Amino acid sequence: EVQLVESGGGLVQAGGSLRLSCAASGFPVTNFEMYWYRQAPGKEREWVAAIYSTGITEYADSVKGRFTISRDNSKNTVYLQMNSLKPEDTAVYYCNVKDNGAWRQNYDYWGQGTQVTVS
Amino acid sequence: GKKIDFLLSVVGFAVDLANVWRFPYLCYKNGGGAFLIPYTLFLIIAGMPLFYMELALGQYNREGAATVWKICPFFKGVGYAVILIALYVGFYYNVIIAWSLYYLFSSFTLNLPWTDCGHTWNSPNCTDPKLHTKYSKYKFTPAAEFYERGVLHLHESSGIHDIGLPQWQLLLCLMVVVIVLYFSLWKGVKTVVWITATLPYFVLFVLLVHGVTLPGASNGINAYLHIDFYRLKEATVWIDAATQIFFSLGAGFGVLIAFASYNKFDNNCYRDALLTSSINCITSFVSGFAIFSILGYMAHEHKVNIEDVATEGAGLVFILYPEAISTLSGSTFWAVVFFVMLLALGLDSSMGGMEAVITGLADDFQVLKRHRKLFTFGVTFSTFLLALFCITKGGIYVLTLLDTFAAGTSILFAVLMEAIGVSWFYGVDRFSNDIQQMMGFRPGLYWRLCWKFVSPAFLLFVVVVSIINFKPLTYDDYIFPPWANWVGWGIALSSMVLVPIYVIYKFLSTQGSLWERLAYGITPENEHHLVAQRDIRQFQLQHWLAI
Ligand SMILES: NC[C@H](O)c1ccc(O)c(O)c1
Ligand SMILES: [Cl-]
């Protein structure tokens, strides 16, 4: 039932802006923790941003001040507003859902991923 | 194999130590069948509905009892109150587990200590039927004497004013109980079932089938299946039935919310509620039938009347089931089986009640989430230290006070506030939409009507009568002093006042005008952007007309 569909990727010039969308289904994004990961070509999955059930957002140091994670509880969508995109930001950005808190560990669903390429 | 696992899970969830220990003496205290009418009625109209409501609340919000009130911030005092109630109830639940452990340890003999007199704990008045004042409890049976004098050592206590020092055998049993609890809770969340979902039913079936054949069991069955309708015109039976419903089902403790907060979001809470309530009803009817068959057997063995043959207090089963075991062949095997069953049931229920507190408070404070071993130790150690009062010589009096006031009017008021906050302020239509999101079907009209009008109305009725028709606390022929009643009402109010206290605190801490503070307190925390937009549903009539 839990389905995450990322969208909003594509080619973008260096220093541009992209907004990724994660159309969540099968759960309310308001009560769950939503994460953004990116797997650069030839690297491991890097955690990018996290918005928690409380709405508190955390970012990786490589994206602090540039990427913004937000959610639309009415649409059950999570966004990743990526600004000042450096060539290094090219990757497959994955949207991940986790359950609320560290003691709830039975939700780790991922999306197919959206490709972002910065030229 | 999977089917067996599902059956074990559902029947183990349905069965509580309350169903096997607490229901018998509220049933006996209220005549039996007359107790089963208010009990069944309350189950149908408030317990199954509110069991379903708590399961859906926890399963949708992924929160414990306190933090689930992000949907209506003003009502978080309700979650704090249910957590406090669960802590209070753990202060004496683990003592019943300790009694079960003591009885299991005493069961490792071919001469069970409760069968005959002539032990060091027996009074000169011990009357062995194998070789009475009318309106008075017997207390002179070998099983009653074993319980009260060789287990409780109650003869060394004059009253709750003189409770004495903690009995050391019960102290060691309580130590074992709480160490087991800690090491069952310290490394993970509570959420064995081949014992706690099969042994209670096997034991109940054995007791029923054997008791129906006991001499005089027919008289107890006739007393049970006799409705004394004069009892139904008093509030005692109704209050007892409502409290037992919420005690056995687990509502008003944060236990259901915390348990469901760890369920899969799409788990069927409707089917869970139906199964748990149906099994609770059946195992309560059969439990009462079996205990009344035993009681009618003791009334014939001891030549005393059924209404006077046994205690109406917490330790009723610790006399009745030993009395039944004594009549069974291979009574040592059956004593071990029964007290292992009681210990397992109580440990499961206590772990669930402790997880209510741990989850409810670690969801609220995330520092506690990084320290589960230490926070679990704090909870278990506090419970042990405050349960040390119920293992004193007069610990039965403390346990009676607690079993009367920790979750009585307080638990009824807490579930009433939960029902109101969910179905009037958050919105029963919104809650039904949440349940549709989880399960795919929207709750039916019966459930919504019960959530918004029927369960709140009946809960308010029981809460009001519990206060205006309060009866001073007694244990058998012992009348507690008035200050004990004031202390018990203080214990009840300690959780009851957390609701208004939190409402006042939330109002004063919030910034803005009066209407801005009200909107922030009734709007969910994740929709507080609407307050600035003047888009509060609760400020429109259509919200409150919703069904
Ligand atoms: N039946 C009561 C329920 O299982 C329960 C609630 C709170 C507790 O601390 C407990 O031990 C048990
Ligand atoms: Cl029950």
Author numbering:
A (entry chain B): 1 to 119
B (entry chain A): 60 to 190, 199 to 258, 262 to 617
What does the paper say about this structure?
Norepinephrine (NE), also known as noradrenaline, is an important neurotransmitter that plays crucial roles in the central nervous system, including the regulation of mood, memory, and alertness. In the brain, NE transporter (NET, encoded by the SLC6A2 gene), a Na+/Cl–-dependent transporter, reuptakes released NE at neuron synapses, thus maintaining NE homeostasis. In this study, we report high-resolution cryo-EM structures of human NET (hNET) bound with different ligands in three distinct states: an NE-bound inward-open state, an NE-bound occluded state, and an outward-open state bound with inhibitors. Each structure consists of a monomer of hNETcryo in complex with one nanobody.
In the complex of hNETcryo_NE with Nb_BF9, an inward-open conformation with the cytosolic cavity open was observed, thus denoted as NET_NE_I. In NET_NE_I, one Cl– but no Na+ was identified. In NET_NE_I, the overall interaction modes are similar to those in NET_NE_Oc, except that the interaction is weakened due to the displacement of F72. The benzene ring of NE accommodated in the hydrophobic pocket becomes exposed to the solvent. As a result, the carbonyl oxygen of F72 can no longer contribute to the stabilization of the ethylamine side chain of NE. Additionally, the hydroxyl group in the ethylamine side chain of NE is hydrated, interacting with Z5 and Z6. Only in NET_NE_I, we observed an elongated density that resembles a second molecule of NE (NE-2) in an exposed shallow pocket near ECL4 and is coordinated by E382, R301, and several hydrophobic residues. Based on the alignment of NET_NE_Oc and NET_NE_I, three notable movements are observed during the transition from occluded to inward-open state: movement of ECL4 towards the cytosol with accompanying rearrangement of ECL2, the dramatic outward movement of the N-terminal half of TM1 (TM1_N) towards the lipid environment, and the unwinding of helical structures of TM5 that becomes more flexible on the cytosolic side. In a close-up view, F72 from TM1 is displaced from the binding pocket, and Y152/D75/NE tilt towards the cytosol. Through these movements, two bound Na+ ions in the occluded state are released, and the cytosolic release cavity becomes open and filled with water molecules, preparing for NE release.
